[PDB]
Amino acid sequence: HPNLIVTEQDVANIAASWESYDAYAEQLNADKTNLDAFMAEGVVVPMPKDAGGGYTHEQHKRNYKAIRNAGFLYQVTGDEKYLTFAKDLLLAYAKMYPSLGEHPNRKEQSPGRLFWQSLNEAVWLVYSIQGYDAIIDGLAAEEKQEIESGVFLPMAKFLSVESPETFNKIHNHGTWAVAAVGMTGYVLGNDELVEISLMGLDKTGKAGFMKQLDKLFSPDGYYTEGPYYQRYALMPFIWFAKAIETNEPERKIFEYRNNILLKAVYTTIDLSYAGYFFPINDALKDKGIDTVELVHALAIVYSITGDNTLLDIAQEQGRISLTGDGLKVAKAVGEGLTQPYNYRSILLGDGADGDQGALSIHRLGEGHNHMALVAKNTSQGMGHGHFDKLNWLLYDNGNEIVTDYGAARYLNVEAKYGGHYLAENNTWAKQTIAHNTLVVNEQSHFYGDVTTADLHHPEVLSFYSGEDYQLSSAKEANAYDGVEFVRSMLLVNVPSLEHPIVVDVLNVSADKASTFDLPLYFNGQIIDFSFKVKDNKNVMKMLGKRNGYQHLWLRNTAPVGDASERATWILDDRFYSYAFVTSTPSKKQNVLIAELGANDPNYNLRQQQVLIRRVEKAKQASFVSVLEPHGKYDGSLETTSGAYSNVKSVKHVSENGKDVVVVDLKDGSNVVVALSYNANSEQVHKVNAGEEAIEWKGFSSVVVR
Amino acid sequence: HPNLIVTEQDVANIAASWESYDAYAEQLNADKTNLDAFMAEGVVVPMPKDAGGGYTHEQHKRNYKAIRNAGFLYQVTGDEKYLTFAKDLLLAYAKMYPSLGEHPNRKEQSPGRLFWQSLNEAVWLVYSIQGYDAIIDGLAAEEKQEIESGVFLPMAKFLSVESPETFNKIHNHGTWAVAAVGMTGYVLGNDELVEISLMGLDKTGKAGFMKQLDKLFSPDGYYTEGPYYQRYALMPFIWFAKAIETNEPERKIFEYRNNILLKAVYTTIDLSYAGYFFPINDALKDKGIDTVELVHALAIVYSITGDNTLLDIAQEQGRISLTGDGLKVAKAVGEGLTQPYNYRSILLGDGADGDQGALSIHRLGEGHNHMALVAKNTSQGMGHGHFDKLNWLLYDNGNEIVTDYGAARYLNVEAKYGGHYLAENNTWAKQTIAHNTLVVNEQSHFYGDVTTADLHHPEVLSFYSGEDYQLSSAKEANAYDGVEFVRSMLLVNVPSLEHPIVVDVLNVSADKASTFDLPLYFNGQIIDFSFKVKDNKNVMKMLGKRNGYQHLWLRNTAPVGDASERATWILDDRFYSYAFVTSTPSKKQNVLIAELGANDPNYNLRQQQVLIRRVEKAKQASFVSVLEPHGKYDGSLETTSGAYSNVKSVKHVSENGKDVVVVDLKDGSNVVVALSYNANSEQVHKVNAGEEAIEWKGFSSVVVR
């Protein structure tokens, strides 16, 4: 002891070297200073009372961190006051815990005892067992027995054999529970606790850690619940793996499933822009790469791989793991070994086998010209999944541009329903209308039914990443009865333009005449539109009755027709223009400008604007658009250039199920995008625009004339 | 030549030493790189066509900066290329200018010839004359004759003798015009142009530069139009003064009126929080200390004073004046002479003699995250003035908390009405309802009439800045017929609380039963209210018909009573709680939660929420409130503490025109604020707060029990 997340050898390395690396010493000293301050308050272990973000919730959180940190500092410094504090905290828990029943402020989740839900109980155990592992050799036998019998063994039993609905779950709850119980198993030398954590309660491998590794990650290391829950589950994954490695290296856990755990870490990094995770599915928008799960995970992977590009990410995190692994990161950074991280375009398969749709990330440019297009062609992702098949997000200039709302939830704010998912998470945040994708008849994909959504996934038709352009194309044939839609999204490098442009082609075919809505949630302030808005007559009414529409105010409608239209907005120092046209036999076309906040008596929803393109009574439609960053606004020096869009118009023609899009530019050049939807790279295609003939080879072609 | 903003000795000093000081070299190289790039485009002088932010507007702007910069670089580096580019630009102007009549894209302002208004013409001249001054050396006689007779002399005459409505103006337009013509006078050796600039067209001193210095600044160096226009006018003030000093040092311009120009520069800095100018009156919210007017002014003042605390601000500006004065700044910064700038509480008198109301800045706390309360008890400030007597702003934690909208205008965005003040600047931004102050009967102060407003100022009753608390108190007797109101605002240090608290007491008395509205414009997301809102029944209607009310949507009304109520919101990592109570005989008390965007078909207004306290059918009211920053939200580490307000309630009693406010805290303690409105330091006062007697001396007292 210790022999878990840190080993005796790690402690020796840290003791010998920590003062020699400034980044590590600064981190250690801050943690030490903060703990010393906390210790001055005495041992404070309150009877459990409060929900998420409430006093007892946050106090028991401060305590598990204190136990872990005191154990670490005892080991590194040899200062007995840290042993005493960790010990006395644990003895207080040991006295209290056997008397605890179900938490009094429970909700619909499995209750904890210390906490309103069992999830936080598992986190408490993951942290606290590390502190115990780090002090155990300095305790009297009676103190060990009291702590083990009073809190650790009863909690481990509670979270495993007493909680099969959680322990056997293939879900982030399951990951945390098996990590907590398995790590306890290693520290206490309890073979049974380790075995059930690895192989499930019945030991057959139908549930447990190994099954989670096999099922929750695709072969690309993409975690099916989405980026936000990927980083969260990454801690119990990487920390239980670390414990397995330090105690049973023969299991070769970091080799398992073609280094799935290593791939999970890189993929977590790859799911961020300007340091923030893509807020698809249930997600909070202030979650970034400095989150401790990725700080610790990066350190472990660096220690294994020696990949010096990880040191770039480490510096961007501005935080370092206080482990033996973190020491290696700090040392490498201090020795000037840092290399730039290779942010790249990727296709991430979803489902265990990678075939259940995919998440595409398309990147182009560098610095403030770095654009990222996210194409959400993924399976449901279980309960946290949103009803947004073929959704997209755009990032540019260090900003989110075309956005995903994330979840309706205020992390650890007790006055917001104990920090838990709000009523509006289901009624607004999960719904299709809340997203940048097709809504049919004001109904959500799969009619907002998670059971149905869980059974289906989009079909990826094409992925391409070149220096000329980037493309993803996917088909959704199961979202609605008698409806199929296909979306192709492109990032195009036009040499004459300062920034890459997005081209979007969303085709829908329906058996019955329908309403088709396509929203665009934008970040910024409207400059102007090419269309005239109808007078709202000094009233804003709720947009629709159900499925998220009840949360939107209609601010203006504007009629549109055959010709492409334009909306231009500003965000910080850059302009963005949305040029759009919809090919359809229906003449009933309108733009709806809407604002979030209807049916929100509790002020749970943020202010937000949206441009919705609506076609009514149509069986067929091709929603075509361009998203173009342009120009410079400098409010400091008081200059402006390039403020007008460089796109004169967008035109579209379909022939024999093949599409041609022509983007006419103000300098007289044009961009031609052609889509055949045929994967045969050698098949030649022809489409007649008017008298103009367009010919190409393969699924797609982009030509700048 | 040059002998204006730089001298021949300055040029020698720069050439000899610019490479030695990193800060100067970085700036010069960045300017040189940008100019070299601009020169590669050739000499481009278009005919005047476009409004503000349009192509010709921004091109003529790039040209005047190029003229100045090429002139400077020719002096410092010697290269013929810089001489020729400045000369060729000026010759193109000389050939075009005599042919120009009124700009074709003029608006209501005095038209320019090069520009849509004459203001920009003046800026062009201020910059361009410096370039000419610096290239005199390498010019032939016929070239000087062409330049002076073709552009400079016609432009100088246009802006002066031909434009009495601007040249005689005691206003920032006047300052820019006299600086432009006066600087031209010095460069051309034209005594007449200098005299009329200093003393006005008729030379009596009724108007012109000297009058502006005596009337537009208070003795404290506060510029009556407000912070945003203070920094703007600061350029022509400080640069014309620089020109006067280098040509006629016997005038002792920097000693004039007890060093008024020096005080003006310090006051400009004192009018910012976290580097941004308080957005009172017409103002844009992205304007900060790195604005070039303050960069140049700071350099001038440092050269005169040697005040090393100005180097702190210089570093925060992140740019350096490319002048001899700027060289001194760079040298001192390189030598490690920087001392921290002393941000402090200040009372700034308004009016020529500082007796026409005042602007109070109250600061408490350390670092760049301290608290700043601004009490706007100032006179009108002419046309750019807002109808917001006794308004207030609050800053905390690097953020604006309780806000001022500034102006409805998009700087140099041509698609937004040529970057000019929008229709909504008058109809929304200037109106009282748009501010954090009293609105009577849905009408603005002075019934929104600038002529009436210009004739009156609030009466300042008290100013105090201590370690215990801070206070401003002011009376507005002239805003409405038969109405008087008084506002006292305090910043209170309560040792048991983590942050100072604001206490607000706004008393109103009216001859007739009236509606009293008190808005609070806040920055952040509502957490919860202590009160119940009425169902809005899925519609938002325009709040009122006139005077800014037509721009607000009513989202919810909520009835309130005798007991204090609370609104709590979150912004970044901190919570803010607004506890409020109104003593009034009227029972008609409601909170209106409103959102901006009605009567805004062009999407000129930002999204914004407001909490308005309304009292109806009342002749008297005391609007009492507490603004309390509290707690910590960490979205990265996922922790929260102190999320609930520590204020249990707020109570108020009035006795013989004297107020007592009791702030009951959750720990059982209380804060007692007493106000007598009697300036006599030794006068004893007594108020019976129920079964309690409150006794104190002086205008105010604050006691923590």
Ligand SMILES: [Zn+2]
């Ligand atoms: Zn979503």
Ligand SMILES: [Zn+2]
């Ligand atoms: Zn204002």
